[PDB]
């Protein structure tokens, strides 16, 4: 007769990831590459968001 023994699939080997273009460049160069840094009592906090 006929007998259903196993199941056939195709296991994948590679994975792909797609995301949209990286756009909103965070302010870092204005902090680490800044020309002037404030005194140690007028400390510079800059908010990055």
């Amino acid at each position: 007769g006929i007998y259903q023994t196993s199941n056939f699939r195709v296991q994948p080997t590679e994975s792909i990831v797609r995301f949209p273009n990286i756009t909103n460049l965070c302010p870092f160069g204005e902090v680490f590459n800044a020309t002037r840094f404030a005194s140690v009592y007028a400390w510079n906090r800059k908010r990055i968001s």
Partner: nanobody
Amino acid sequence: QVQLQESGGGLVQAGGSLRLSCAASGSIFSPNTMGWFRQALGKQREMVAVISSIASTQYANFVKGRFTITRDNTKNTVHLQMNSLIPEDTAVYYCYAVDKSQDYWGQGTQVTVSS
């Protein structure tokens, strides 16, 4: 662009009087501190005086009881009364806004006293 205008120096004989002025424009958030600093050719910045938002006045021991700072709240300006001058005071001065962020210095006022 925070800009501070300096005025009121020049040539004065020994014993004369002058009135310097720094007027501040730009951001200059409310808790600011206006100071004045000395430099003669051959020396570094010598701290002369300081006024904060508290209106407290601070002066160095070099010129005890001779110079004064006046504070104008309406225009947020500063006037330094230079009285009882002595040729040891021959030095260009610069004023300094501590503020809360990037600091800004002056363009200079030539103060000369000799006989």
